[PDB]
Amino acid sequence: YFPYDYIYPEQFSYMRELKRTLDAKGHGVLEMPSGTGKTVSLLALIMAYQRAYPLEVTKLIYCSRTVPEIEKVIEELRKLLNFYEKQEGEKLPFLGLALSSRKNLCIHPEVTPLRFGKDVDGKCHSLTASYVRAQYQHDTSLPHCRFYEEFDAHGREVPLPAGIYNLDDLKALGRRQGWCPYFLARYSILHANVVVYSYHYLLDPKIADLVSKELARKAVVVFDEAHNIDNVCIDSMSVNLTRRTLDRCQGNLETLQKTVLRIKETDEQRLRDEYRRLVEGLREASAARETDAHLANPVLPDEVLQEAVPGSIRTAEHFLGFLRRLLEYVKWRLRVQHVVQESPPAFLSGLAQRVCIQRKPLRFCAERLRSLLHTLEITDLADFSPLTLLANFATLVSTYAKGFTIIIEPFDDRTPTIANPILHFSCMDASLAIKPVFERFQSVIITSGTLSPLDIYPKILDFHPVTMATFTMTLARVCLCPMIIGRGNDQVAISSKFETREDIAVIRNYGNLLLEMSAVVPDGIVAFFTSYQYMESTVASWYEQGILENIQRNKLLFIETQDGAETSVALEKYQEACENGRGAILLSVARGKVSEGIDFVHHYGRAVIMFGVPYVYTQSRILKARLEYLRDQFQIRENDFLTFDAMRHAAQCVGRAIRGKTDYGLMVFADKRFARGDKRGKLPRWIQEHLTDANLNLTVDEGVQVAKYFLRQMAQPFHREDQLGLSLLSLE
Amino acid sequence: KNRMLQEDPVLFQLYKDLVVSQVISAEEFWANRLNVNATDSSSTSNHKQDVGISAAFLADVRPQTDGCNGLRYNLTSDIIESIFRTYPAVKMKYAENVPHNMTEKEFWTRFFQSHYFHRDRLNTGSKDLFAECAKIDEKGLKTMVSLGVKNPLLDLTALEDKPLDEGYGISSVPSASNSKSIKENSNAAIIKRFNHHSAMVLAAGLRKQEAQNEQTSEPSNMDGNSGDADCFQPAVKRAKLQESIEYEDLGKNNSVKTIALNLKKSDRYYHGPTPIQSLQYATSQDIINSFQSIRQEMEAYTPKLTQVLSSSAASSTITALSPGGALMQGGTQQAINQMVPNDIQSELKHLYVAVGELLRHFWSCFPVNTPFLEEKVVKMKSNLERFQVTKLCPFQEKIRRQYLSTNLVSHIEEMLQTAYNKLHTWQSRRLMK
Amino acid sequence: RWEGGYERTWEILKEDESGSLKATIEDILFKAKRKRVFEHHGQVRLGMMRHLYVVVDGSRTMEDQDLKPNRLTCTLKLLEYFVEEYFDQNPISQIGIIVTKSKRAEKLTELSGNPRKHITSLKKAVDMTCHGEPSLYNSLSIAMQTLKHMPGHTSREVLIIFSSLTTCDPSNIYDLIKTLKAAKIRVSVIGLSAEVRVCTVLARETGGTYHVILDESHYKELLTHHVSPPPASSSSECSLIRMGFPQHTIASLSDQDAKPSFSMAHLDGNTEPGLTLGGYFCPQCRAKYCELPVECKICGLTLVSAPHLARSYHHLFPLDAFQEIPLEEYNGERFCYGCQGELKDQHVYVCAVCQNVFCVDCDVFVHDSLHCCPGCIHKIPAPSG
Numbered sequence A: 001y002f003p004y005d006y007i008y009p010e011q012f013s014y015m016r017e018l019k020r021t022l023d024a025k026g027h028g029v030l031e032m033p034s035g036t037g038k039t040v041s042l043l044a045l046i047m048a049y050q051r052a053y054p055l056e057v058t059k060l061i062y063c064s065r066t067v068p069e070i071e072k073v074i075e076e077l078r079k080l081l082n083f084y085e086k087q088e089g090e091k092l093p094f095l096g097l098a099l100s101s102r103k104n105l106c107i108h109p110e111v112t113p114l115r116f117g118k119d120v121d122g123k124c125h126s127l128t129a130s131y132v133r134a135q136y137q138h139d140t141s142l143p144h145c146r147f148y149e150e151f152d153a154h155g156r157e158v159p160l161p162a163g164i165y166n167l168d169d170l171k172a173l174g175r176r177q178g179w180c181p182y183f184l185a186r187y188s189i190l191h192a193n194v195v196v197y198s199y200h201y202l203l204d205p206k207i208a209d210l211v212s213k214e215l216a217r218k219a220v221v222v223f224d225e226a227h228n229i230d231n232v233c234i235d236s237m238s239v240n241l242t243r244r245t246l247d248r249c250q251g252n253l254e255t256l257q258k259t260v261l262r263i264k265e266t267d268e269q270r271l272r273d274e275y276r277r278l279v280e281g282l283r284e285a286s287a288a289r290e291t292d293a294h295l296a297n298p299v300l301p302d303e304v305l306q307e308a309v310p311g312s313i314r315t316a317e318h319f320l321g322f323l324r325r326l327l328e329y330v331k332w333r334l335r336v337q338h339v340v341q342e343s344p345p346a347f348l349s350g351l352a353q354r355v356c357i358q359r360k361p362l363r364f365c366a367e368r369l370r371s372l373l374h375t376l377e378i379t380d381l382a383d384f385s386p387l388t389l390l391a392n393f394a395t396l397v398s399t400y401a402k403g404f405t406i407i408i409e410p411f412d413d414r415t416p417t418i419a420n421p422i423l424h425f426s427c428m429d430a431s432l433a434i435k436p437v438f439e440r441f442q443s444v445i446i447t448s449g450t451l452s453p454l455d456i457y458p459k460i461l462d463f464h465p466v467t468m469a470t471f472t473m474t475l476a477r478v479c480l481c482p483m484i485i486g487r488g489n490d491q492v493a494i495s496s497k498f499e500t501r502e503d504i505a506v507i508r509n510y511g512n513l514l515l516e517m518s519a520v521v522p523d524g525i526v527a528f529f530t531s532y533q534y535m536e537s538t539v540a541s542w543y544e545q546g547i548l549e550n551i552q553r554n555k556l557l558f559i560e561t562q563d564g565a566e567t568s569v570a571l572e573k574y575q576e577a578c579e580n581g582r583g584a585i586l587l588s589v590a591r592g593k594v595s596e597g598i599d600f601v602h603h604y605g606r607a608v609i610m611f612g613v614p615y616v617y618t619q620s621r622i623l624k625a626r627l628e629y630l631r632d633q634f635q636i637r638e639n640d641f642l643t644f645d646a647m648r649h650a651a652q653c654v655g656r657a658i659r660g661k662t663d664y665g666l667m668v669f670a671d672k673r674f675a676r677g678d679k680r681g682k683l684p685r686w687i688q689e690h691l692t693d694a695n696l697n698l699t700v701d702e703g704v705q706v707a708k709y710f711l712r713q714m715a716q717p718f719h720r721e722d723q724l725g726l727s728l729l730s731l732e
Numbered sequence B: 001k002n003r004m005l006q007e008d009p010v011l012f013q014l015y016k017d018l019v020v021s022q023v024i025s026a027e028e029f030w031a032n033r034l035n036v037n038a039t040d041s042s043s044t045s046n047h048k049q050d051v052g053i054s055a056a057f058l059a060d061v062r063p064q065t066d067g068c069n070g071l072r073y074n075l076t077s078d079i080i081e082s083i084f085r086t087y088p089a090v091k092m093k094y095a096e097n098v099p100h101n102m103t104e105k106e107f108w109t110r111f112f113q114s115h116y117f118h119r120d121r122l123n124t125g126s127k128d129l130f131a132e133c134a135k136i137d138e139k140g141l142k143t144m145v146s147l148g149v150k151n152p153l154l155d156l157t158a159l160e161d162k163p164l165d166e167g168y169g170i171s172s173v174p175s176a177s178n179s180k181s182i183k184e185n186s187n188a189a190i191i192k193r194f195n196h197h198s199a200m201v202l203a204a205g206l207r208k209q210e211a212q213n214e215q216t217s218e219p220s221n222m223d224g225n226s227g228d229a230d231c232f233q234p235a236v237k238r239a240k241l242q243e244s245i246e247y248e249d250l251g252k253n254n255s256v257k258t259i260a261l262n263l264k265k266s267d268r269y270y271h272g273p274t275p276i277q278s279l280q281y282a283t284s285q286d287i288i289n290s291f292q293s294i295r296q297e298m299e300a301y302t303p304k305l306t307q308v309l310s311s312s313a314a315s316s317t318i319t320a321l322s323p324g325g326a327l328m329q330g331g332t333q334q335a336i337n338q339m340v341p342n343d344i345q346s347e348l349k350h351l352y353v354a355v356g357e358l359l360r361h362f363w364s365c366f367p368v369n370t371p372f373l374e375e376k377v378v379k380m381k382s383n384l385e386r387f388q389v390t391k392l393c394p395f396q397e398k399i400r401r402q403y404l405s406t407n408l409v410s411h412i413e414e415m416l417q418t419a420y421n422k423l424h425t426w427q428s429r430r431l432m433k
Numbered sequence C: 001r002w003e004g005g006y007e008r009t010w011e012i013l014k015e016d017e018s019g020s021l022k023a024t025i026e027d028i029l030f031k032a033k034r035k036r037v038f039e040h041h042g043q044v045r046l047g048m049m050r051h052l053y054v055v056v057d058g059s060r061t062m063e064d065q066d067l068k069p070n071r072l073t074c075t076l077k078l079l080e081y082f083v084e085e086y087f088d089q090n091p092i093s094q095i096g097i098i099v100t101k102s103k104r105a106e107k108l109t110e111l112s113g114n115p116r117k118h119i120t121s122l123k124k125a126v127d128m129t130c131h132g133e134p135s136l137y138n139s140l141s142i143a144m145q146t147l148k149h150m151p152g153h154t155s156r157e158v159l160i161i162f163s164s165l166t167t168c169d170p171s172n173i174y175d176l177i178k179t180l181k182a183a184k185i186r187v188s189v190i191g192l193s194a195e196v197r198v199c200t201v202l203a204r205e206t207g208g209t210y211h212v213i214l215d216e217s218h219y220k221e222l223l224t225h226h227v228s229p230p231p232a233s234s235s236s237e238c239s240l241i242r243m244g245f246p247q248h249t250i251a252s253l254s255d256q257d258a259k260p261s262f263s264m265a266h267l268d269g270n271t272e273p274g275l276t277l278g279g280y281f282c283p284q285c286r287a288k289y290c291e292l293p294v295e296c297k298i299c300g301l302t303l304v305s306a307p308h309l310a311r312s313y314h315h316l317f318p319l320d321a322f323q324e325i326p327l328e329e330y331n332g333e334r335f336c337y338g339c340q341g342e343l344k345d346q347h348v349y350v351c352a353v354c355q356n357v358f359c360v361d362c363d364v365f366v367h368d369s370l371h372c373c374p375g376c377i378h379k380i381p382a383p384s385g
């Protein structure tokens, strides 16, 4: 049951956390210090619950947010697999399925090395179940999808795989025995005992990626770092719509008509046999691997699509419905570009004036979009991809709009002119994204190492039996140095009151507080800016005015790019440029997606400097409806979460460098807003012993010697740090 | 080899008399003198501000790139050279525009005046380096693809083609993105300029020793803060075992040295009937006898008045108070007998000891018949005549007088002998053909 | 706020047990602040005839004060003491003073044992600018190529004085691990008030011991920790042969004053540029020059002088320990077995074998100056066999 050595008295602090949340079917919220193996804590009891079957049943789904750390989950549990294996004697059967679908896909050297995921998987599925489903037999057009054919033969066969694999395993096994990740995974979902994949993949309302069978008997799912659920769920149902998309769609309108015109009865009587079968008994014909290729369920919590074949009986008639839609939709676009308008169910009502038959052909469209292409089975998917966007949209507008939100954003965001207007359909109820989750599941446990206010689980608007505060001791001398700055000499203004471009007199001493941090602190630092143009504003005075003149002389600097390609470059450098004779401080952005998937080690990356209040500051009026609805839920929330949204991202970013429990961390706080907000947002285990013991308005020049005093002592021989042997009560 | 013998006049003064007194050749001079300092003494001109410069100067290349309109050309590296010592294809580009800017001094300003500020599009040569660095980053792009682990460019891409989104997350900039078009253009180039300066490590990391493993992710990464690996393991009884046997040998042979043994047991044998204890009986009797004799101190009142034993005690005092007849003035020809041998023969003799130590060295292994090289077995023969002849006229120059000569030649014949010892001992191990 | 809060730090410190006996326990805590790490020795195996390499970071880190007016002033002054106390303890060794300054490395004093040469070098090293950045790669280059030509029967250890800065040197010093791991050369650094992970990985990949400077007292401790010849890695050597026993010469043996001075450019010996009158004599060159218990340049063997250097470590290993009791077994007439006094600060120091009563000033005098209990004498040598 892997105590395996001194475990820094925590597994016992989490032992009863399982036994309360699982034996009593507790939903459950865990605080966890960033300095704790996210699974060595959790899975060691979870895999212990896998062996300890209660009445009978113990499922496992797990998810996280980044596919390298997904494999890092897998990585040491293989020894945990091996650990008790020798100890309990023999070895029982196991499976953990890393199912990163859209990522690793085809071994074939022609399909494979085209860069993006979705379009190339469209080439794959167009080849498999659109070319070799339409043109079944053949020699050259059939090509060579041997791995899918191997799966079809293996469907009759019953193998038994080994343990949990990776995305590089099925790749090398593609030339050996594996029949490719997509289907070997379908056969392994049949008897899966543990699934790990992305937090995103489950939470796709666009294509409803139903992972298991809907079996809520004991559906046992585990959650780590589940911080920005809104930024998942609302963005999971967020619908962007380009004018350039529509005109391309306008161009393949009559393009598809030419396919209709050239086909007289060949694909048309193919429809006629089965469109009659659509009327007689309803059954999907694209339910092979095309169910996950097409919009599985845009609006999942519905009863059924009972009266399919909506007010539309023919195909060009159905095509005219989109002519009735799109051409009206640009009429619902182009005039509307003068005023931002937030009217979600009023739009569909005014649409009902314009659309002749509504609310059934709005909801029964995206399949009849697809199915009238399914009798074709011709059009390449990336060509058809901006169209599937559209029949997704009014389908979403058809069903869930009165609780949800329509926003129209034509004006200046990377367009200085009006050259690309856009609108968006957001949802608002991440609850209603996670209510079907909860109804499909048993009672499933969030763990977030950043979540200090427990009051934000009712921002998820849900119920909780178990929600406490995890308190761990530190006989490791001192876990960390949290250091709120508040300079008095250079007069702290670190919140953007006079904003990131309103004055540079604020900015005259962020270099000073950094270079001295650079001068003292060795061994690589990853700091967090607010945004890319903020970052662009950050270094804007830094070149022309004299700033780097000692900064490059002390360590070096790793610019992270708006483009993720060049952003991954310095990364290749930073893991190297620290581990050689160079400190090489990396420079980065909190809210940007450079802040996940890393888990910095004492090897490289052991200090973080705050820069400003880490709040949104960018997207207009996505607030107000989201604001007023929680004001329709709890009514004093303007002040409230608009603190915590910064805070939930802060230690999400900031509290990352410390792992194990001796790994160090210098998480200083250059901030103007600290009085309650930083204190509310910091962990109750972390405000208590460490944050502002007697160090609040710590001018950097004074705070210089703090880290000096910190490290020099803390780099002395560590004879023993909270050594546990046998069980001696202690009772916390 | 010749700049070595000219910049150093002391070693040249050593190198003179092998040509002046014709001791050895230059071929023999660089055959057995240097041989080690070819790595040690030549370790100055090669390093020179750490060559294979990757992460030493690169910290200071940007702050020390400009003092003034002509603040350049310090020494060798001064402030321009290691800039050239990193860029290679860009060094070919420098060579391309030196005639474009005519004067090299003009090039030093022009080629670096506009590239320093924002952007350099005035000359083909400046544009050559400018366009190349975009290709360099394009070239640097391909190398980062080959590593491809712990790189969330992979991990980010899986979440954006899937809904066809995160193009709005790019296109969502606040704060007046309408009418400037200045620093938007500028800063990304400075972003690009310092990423060049960042990849200038990468542009010089290949210079190190080509530095390649490119990271196939090594899928273990076992978080080992625990475990107690405890890297060093001494104390498996190594000097415990020495102490058990050497003090045992210091027990059974306690100081078998010069006076340390031979006087020791000889007087222990003189103790004689000590196991018989008849001497020890009389001892313990004499322990009991003068037991009382000390404490009374009437016998030890007058254990002083023997002026009979003062005169002799005064005598060897006075005898050692005046030693006489031992050449009080022992020097006073030594100044002449210093400056004449310490003009050449201090260095001349040193010509031998740079060689004769190696002459001891090849014979220090020769009967094993391993270090038996033709380079060495005739180097036995080579300097043998090259030294023992060239001393004979320095020997014969000082036998101008007789007792002025015969004192110092008692001490020089070791040089003749340690030569002939080696030669004499050479055939004690008779070498075959 | 802070005008009170600056003096809330004084409120508790100044105040104590009031009424009577004030500012008393504050002095007791200062004595309770004392008594830091004692010895924790007891080792075996290796440590013999070291060949040390002083490596000095000369950088801009020296300009910070932090202990002294210069960090070299903290460094350089006690190195002379470290030199002398080394030559006190370990004369069978020699030390390479090598200085890094401006991204290069200058082997300042060669690998040798002549103290005055080393100390005046430090006295020359006073007015050093320490311009430029540290480069260890040039330092290891000298360290390789010099010790490359040393025998494998030599102890191969390197003492680096690093000012905790960026290790500013190219050319794959991470690959110098396998260079020097194979070369069986140990490398020990201590960081000046901070840590370098790569250098910390270097020493933990070495077997050399790394530390961080805490204070000037603490600076002395690790020097003192590295005075002792440490048990380095196994399979270095066993023996070292042709240890030349010399002769002193009086130059008055048979022929009284037949030579005005025994250094006239022809005599066997007379190595260094100075006049001499005959004091010494080596076996193999038969080298007569100024007396030196080290080695020579023509016989090239080791001028061993046994009572000095074959005596120094010869009792530096075989130590034992005492014990402490606060009790009162009043052995003597409330006395000490050594100095014969009493204060009774409950540290009645009893030997492990002969079990004799000592004080701190008798324990320190053993454990720093006498290095053995003489109570074992009269107790070992009488039944010894």
Ligand code: SF4
Pocket: A105, A106, A107, A108, A111, A124, A125, A128, A145, A146, A147, A148, A179, A180, A181, A182
């Ligand atoms: S099915 Fe398996 S092989 Fe065939 S395309 Fe998709 S990956 Fe490439």
Ligand SMILES: [Zn+2]
Pocket: B360, C283, C284, C285, C286, C298, C299, C300
């Ligand atoms: Zn000799």
Ligand SMILES: [Zn+2]
Pocket: C336, C337, C338, C339, C340, C357, C358, C359, C360, C361, C362, C363
């Ligand atoms: Zn005592």
Ligand SMILES: [Zn+2]
Pocket: C351, C354, C355, C356, C373, C374, C375, C376, C377
């Ligand atoms: Zn004793």
